[PDB]
Paper text:
Conversely, in the truncated TgPK1 structure all of the B domains were visible in the electron density, with one monomer remarkably displaying a closed conformation for this domain. This large structural rearrangement involving a rigid body motion of the B domain resulted in a maximum displacement of nearly 20 Å. Steric hindrance effects would prevent the binding of the nucleotide to this conformation; consequently we defined it as inactive. Two hinge bending motion regions were identified containing two conserved Pro residues, P125 and P216, at which point the B domain pivots towards the A domain by rotating ∼68°, generating a 77% closed conformation compared to the open conformation. Finally, a disordered region was exclusively associated with the closing of the AB cleft in the truncated TgPK1, the Gly300 to Ile306 loop. In the disordered conformation, additional electron density was observed and modeled as a sulfate molecule binding three side chain hydroxyl groups of residues Thr437, Thr439 and Thr442. In the new conformation present in the truncated TgPK1, when the Lys515-Ser522 is ordered, the carboxylate group of Glu516 occupies the position of the sulfate group.
During glycolysis, pyruvate kinase (PK) catalyzes the irreversible phosphorylation of ADP at the expense of phosphoenolpyruvate (PEP), yielding pyruvate and ATP. Previous characterization of cytoplasmic T. gondii pyruvate kinase (TgPK1), using either parasite extracts or a recombinant purified enzyme, indicated that this enzyme was allosterically activated by glucose 6-phosphate (G6P), which enhanced its activity under PEP unsaturated conditions. We solved the structure of two different constructs of TgPK1: the full-length enzyme (Met1 to Glu531 plus its N-terminal 6×His tag), which crystallized in the absence of substrates, effectors or added ions (“full TgPK1”); and an N-terminal truncated version starting at position Ile39 (“truncated TgPK1”).
Residue numbers in the entry:
A (entry chain C): 36 to 407, 411 to 518, 521 to 531
B (entry chain B): 42 to 139, 145 to 172, 174 to 218, 221 to 300, 306 to 394, 396 to 404, 411 to 514, 522 to 531
C (entry chain A): 41 to 131, 137 to 481, 484 to 514, 521 to 531
D (entry chain D): 40 to 407, 410 to 482, 484 to 499, 501 to 515, 521 to 531
């Protein structure tokens, strides 16, 4: 920065400013936002996507939640919130402790971890739910227990047990989660429960995305796609990257997927903490280059579960994800179990807006040109260039499959993108794309007509004014092709 | 390395630079005009320094006949005025010559003894005066003034050619006289001339005057000032602003004349107005079936400077090898264009129309399009695309007969006549099919289409 | 990805470019711990004059000199961090949300639930209806409703219970107290100068006049001492460019700023201040809220590691540890992991893009000496140089090179002790003190560099030497 | 720039052109006073054309050069020996009377060089003509005034058909487009000239006519040996074989002369400009001097002004990036040898104002991994722009430092300082370099003496200078501010 004055960043933003941020916001449903009234307030605040966390709840309880989303949307007929099912997936847990009493292990003390899950544990020996532990872990390996509370180094392996040594002093309760840094977990990513949730809830309840916890290989993604079948053709797959296997297989996972969710907090249980930030950056960049949405999740605004303001570090952490290039930022417990769900959504919208203040759009556009072509991409690229060249107020992306909108968004134009589509599922899928807002349009509508309608609607809503330039892009037969770019003036 | 590759006819006939040929007794007959079409002629120049309306009408009707044998061709016709010229006549065997008599009778085939003068009032405009001939190379002193002749003594030992300029100190002629006015009004308009090339233009007033003379009856005629003197060079900016294009002739040291050609071409380029380099290109080919190295290099540097058109004068008008000359001009242009494409686009660097024309040229490159289609009614879309010098052919589609003739002067564009079909997408579909039937595109190939006004760029692939 | 997942050796993370400031305290100030801290990455020792007496900081200094005996190649800089202006409440009371609280200028008044005393006598002059007043580390927030000549009436925004004589903050407001009080004056003149402190980190700097006053205070006897204003409030931020122009360098105090500014704007303020320090080549220190959890835990959190790395990616010269080293259970481990995070962070710095960005960002005209520094950076790149040598008396040559952020280590050779120590805050620089012609100074530095494995036979070196005229030399190691 | 076309270039201006001018010696600039005037006009190199004259005759010329330099002690002229090399000629004709061939006429060409020729038949001096050529080959006669197409080949004759109408005389030159001439590039005559004149007479360059192979360069260098170490070889590229083998020829060479007139007799005229541009750019990239030669200002043999076309051709060579431009008949055999050098210098000055210098350095970095010495040279050019320096000083013993700076084409003058007299001579061929001979010694001392003279003749107190030094091994670059 030079010639730009410090007092500039100290202007308060108006509702009109921060609600027009480009980054998309994902909110986890829960008791704190159980009722229709707060869901509506969350829409106004910036909510674009509703996450159903299937680690808890059942088909009945999540049905009530869905019914409430549908009611909120009746009060806001212009909002087309997407619904994301987030699977439970594989889990490793410690077993039970004598008298349910927590145990404290001392640094350098010996802990046996056994495979018999009936074993009632004590300070010296505990049970682990993962039967293949002794055949997964080797001497020198690290095992984390209770959200990384306790760290043990593996000293010896038997057939049905492992001898470990505490790396720190800690107090652990019973049935705590376990992590196996640098070790593949030999458990199905999509178990029978997950399969039931995808097929018997996700499909008939109108979920638009599946976020699949703990994806370890691209075969996991191919598996969900075949599971989804023709009846689930309108559902997009968002693998969650949570360990080393996910990281090591990232490129093949990304290629098979419709987008990525980066679970930082889980990744920090599986690799040195000082490397998670590198991984995030790398994974966002790779998603960007290929034009697929990336969600940044976990450890976002966690203090707001209890406080009406986030910490400095938290605001910075969210802002840097935006600057890394993230499509979405995600709230978890802050909205599910928080004292300030709507205030948390407004706050993240504000942090997004301020980070987007930092974005160099010419240098992002040219960075994508040096990193990446087809007819569709060339025209999307020409559109962004031309929009900038003629000082256009907005870019119209006319789109059936979403491709056209995504290709333009990929180039991070300074101008807002209005994606126009007759397809309901496409409009929903687009709620996950930075820089895009959405308008559903009737079927069998001519190109010019659709463009005419969008501009006059925009002019009535005081988004564009008489005389400003507009850039419209029409991808035709998007994934089977012919591509248009029109420049027109608001009358 | 691939410098030494001989050129197939398919290759060099695809040259982008336009070729203007001067009509003359050596080439005006239907049979040789057809062979000239085949070799690369795009524009026919009628030089009104010579001959009458009857002569020039015969030339025009022959052009029409030639076009009936080559229906796909759309030769433009340029009228080049006489203007205030005072030039020497033709010499024996077209050979340059090394006590001299200058005559008013321009039928004289001159020699060392006596030469002719294009200015019929030369005797009344000079018994002791001085006359400079061939840009001040020969200087003569008038000994005697007769009725229709002058006797001079060569006050300098020098060698002079034919059709060379003559200055007369202590003697002023209008840019457009009554004879020029008559030619423009009574031939230019009724004979279907598309261009007026106005000799010795000196200011933008000259341009506006011709535009005033042309009026509504000549609205379809475009004006090309010739910059031939210092005044026209001094007023070039104003002249270009009013003009439709520019013609650079020879007629400040030569150490500085080379700067003038570069400056004037570059300025025409920037503004997308066509420029014709008409600077005595391949003069040896009046007598020889082959150019010299220096002549070939002279044309090539014109093309590299960015000229839209190169022009043949005596080489086609009074030459022994008119068809072969056009051919070797097509061949030179092609080699020069060979080393001319991402450089000119980034070196050219606005309105919506130009923003889209520029975007279309970039997409074409990016997508590796076979051709760029320029849907145009006034020619402007085609011109705006062309000024970006794309690597791919520009095919211009127009319902406007006169627009299609004006376009013959634009480097990089071929034309195709399209019915006034109120539908852009229909016109593109229809035109692609004829491009196939011309083998300019094949199935699978990419095309970029442009229409200006609502400005449009469309990328499709040929079925 | 797995290039990212390469488990780093001690040899790797010990070569990090970013400098590390550690705060001295009872947890670390013993000779043996200080030694382990040098090996871990510590480059600068901060003496926090907010606490302790001249005796405590003197023995600390003495312990640092002894540690340097165990490490002769190490040259630690010492930074005196001032107490500076303070506001304090008078003489524990709970007040619930919405309750009226009076704050008075009569400091001899013993307080209660309704009326409390303030040490800041010009409080009415500074504050107005609307302003917020923070008490006891921002634990209580009150809003001013009306102002009298010797009192202020406020409304509590949260329920809190406050103790006796706690701090106060005045968001968005200039505090009219001397930035260097008589106490700070004594600390600078009667400790800073005689104990050989190299930097003064001046707390709560609010204007360019504060910086000029300090340098005037230092005078010719403190010529060798550089001034690092601390940016801790809105007044400091608003006055940033004029403060920076007078300053030798800048310390960013995020936590403090977080008291006066919405959290969602502090990150912006950090970015901008670092960027401005870079473009002008003056060192910047990122302080507070670094690896705070490591006061009690042997490992940092994911979010803490990320926060540190982002400071590095923003362009910070130094990162600074506070309570982590001064009072923590793992002072040595904290430095090592700080060093480790810096290494990972510098692992994704685009050095061609940083040099290009800087070359386009810097305003003209650039000087002879800045032109040669640029040239050395580009030459180093074309030639695939292993290191850049900077022969410098004042430190300018080294600083100008470092601001262009070369891939290669910069080894700065100087005969000036103060210069060697000032360079400890400069990202990418390593120092070697020398006594006094270019030739055998260069030859000897190559020997040491070769043995340190920074260069091997047949590789190229770039040596730069300012003195006014500038030299740039490329040689082959032999 | 319209005012650049109008305002007349003042004396001091054109005198400072960057391009080097090579002048051919002969009767028209025979005497010392004319050569002295040519020095003032901008002559940098004197070419001796060994196609004519002998060792006595060319020795007189050198004496007159040595003497002209005594009147201009600051001038250091390079002398260049241009070999005759191999030649092909027609034979004699009945009654010595020239013959006129009509287009389409058949002409037999025989190998018996004793045959007195006819309208119907002539001899050729090249005995291997029929084995060199086949049906379809073109043969050019008398500077290409007559072209004939080969129709039939025998053991000792070829049958041809004229492609045009021409009249030709006796003993006229002949060219064989796209055919290797199997005659020594360095014959016994050429070897004698190189060893027995070139070396002992102090020539600085050999321009080898008609180089077809890199072996020709190696042969010449073998010839010169230890005794001719100080002599640099400039192959002349004149036919298809020189073009095919150009990269190899340039790799061995110290520089290149482009003989355009000759090339236009060997390849289509419309391909010569390509060849010229290509050859200059390649020389530029690798930092070796290139001379553009023949058909430069020919009309000035008889006229006090050149043609529009000629001027533009010289200018475009300068813009192509030529280091030197050469005059032949214009100074050897013309009426205006001084005026020709002069107008050549002014043409060079004017074309160099069109040069986009920052674009040249940018294009040079992308085209040319690169060494330590070239890195410091490039860093000097960049720093000079950056700092707005008056001059670049290049301290050099072999010339290498000066040549590496000059290939980056800085906007500022390069003042090269050397203790080596022959290096100073070699540098007469490098664009943008001026030369000062220095005593045989510290290097910070030589710079002070060069700043205390530039003040007299360039820089003024307070201006920035960039100095550069090599070891051609370490390299240095100083930026200092004039006293």
């Amino acid at each position: 920065f030079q010639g730009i004055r410090m007092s500039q960043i100290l202007e308060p933003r108006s509702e009109e400013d921060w609600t027009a941020h480009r980054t998309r916001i994902v909110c986890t449903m829960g008791p704190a936002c159980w009722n229709v009234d707060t869901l509506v307030k969350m829409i106004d605040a910036g909510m674009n996507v509703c996450r159903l966390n299937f680690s808890h709840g059942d088909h009945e309880t999540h049905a009530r939640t869905v019914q409430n989303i549908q009611e909120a949307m009746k009060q806001r007929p212009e909002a087309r919130l997407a619904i994301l099912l987030d699977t439970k997936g594989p889990e490793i847990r410690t077993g039970f402790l004598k008298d349910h009493k927590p145990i404290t292990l001392q640094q350098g003390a010996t802990l046996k971890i056994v495979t018999d899950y009936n074993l009632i544990g004590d300070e010296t020996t505990i049970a682990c739910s993962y039967g293949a532990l002794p055949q997964s872990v080797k001497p020198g390996n690290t095992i984390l227990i209770a959200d990384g509370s306790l760290s043990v180094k593996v000293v010896e392996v038997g057939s049905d047990y492992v001898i470990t040594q505490a790396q720190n002093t800690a107090t652990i309760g019973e049935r705590k989660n376990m992590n196996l840094p640098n070790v593949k977990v030999q458990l199905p990513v999509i178990g029978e429960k997950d399969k039931h949730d995808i097929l018997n809830f996700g499909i008939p309840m109108g979920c638009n995305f599946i976020a699949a916890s703990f994806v370890q290989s691209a075969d996991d993604v191919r598996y969900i796609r075949g599971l989804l079948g023709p009846r689930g053709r309108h559902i997009r797959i968002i693998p969650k990257i949570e360990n080393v296997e996910g990281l090591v297989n990232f490129d093949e996972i990304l290629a098979e997927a419709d987008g990525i969710m980066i679970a930082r907090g889980d990744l920090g249980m599986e690799i040195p903490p000082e490397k998670v930030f590198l991984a995030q950056k790398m994974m966002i960049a790779k998603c960007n280059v290929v034009g697929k949405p990336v969600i940044t999740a976990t450890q976002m605004l966690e203090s707001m579960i209890k406080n009406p303001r986030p910490t400095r570090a938290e605001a910075a952490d969210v802002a840097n994800a935006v600057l890394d290039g993230t499509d979405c930022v995600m709230l978890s417990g802050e909205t599910a179990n928080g004292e300030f769900p709507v205030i948390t959504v407004e706050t993240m919208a504000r942090i997004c807006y301020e980070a987007e203040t930092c974005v160099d759009y010419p240098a992002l556009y040219r960075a994508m040109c040096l990193a990446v072509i087809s007819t569709q991409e060339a025209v999307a690229r020409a559109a962004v260039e031309t929009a900038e060249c003629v000082n256009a107020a907005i870019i119209l992306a006319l789109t059936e499959t979403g491709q056209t909108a995504r290709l333009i968004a990929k180039y991070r134009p300074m101008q807002p993108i209005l994606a126009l589509s007759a397809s309901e599922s496409t409009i929903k899928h687009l709620q996950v794309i930075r820089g895009v807002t959405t308008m559903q349009v009737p079927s069998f509508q001519g190109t010019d007509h659709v463009i005419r309608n969008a501009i006059v609607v925009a002019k009535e809503r005081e988004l564009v004014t008489e005389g400003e330039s507009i850039v419209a892009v029409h991808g035709m037969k998007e994934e089977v092709s012919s591509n248009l770019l029109k420049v027109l003036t608001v009358e």
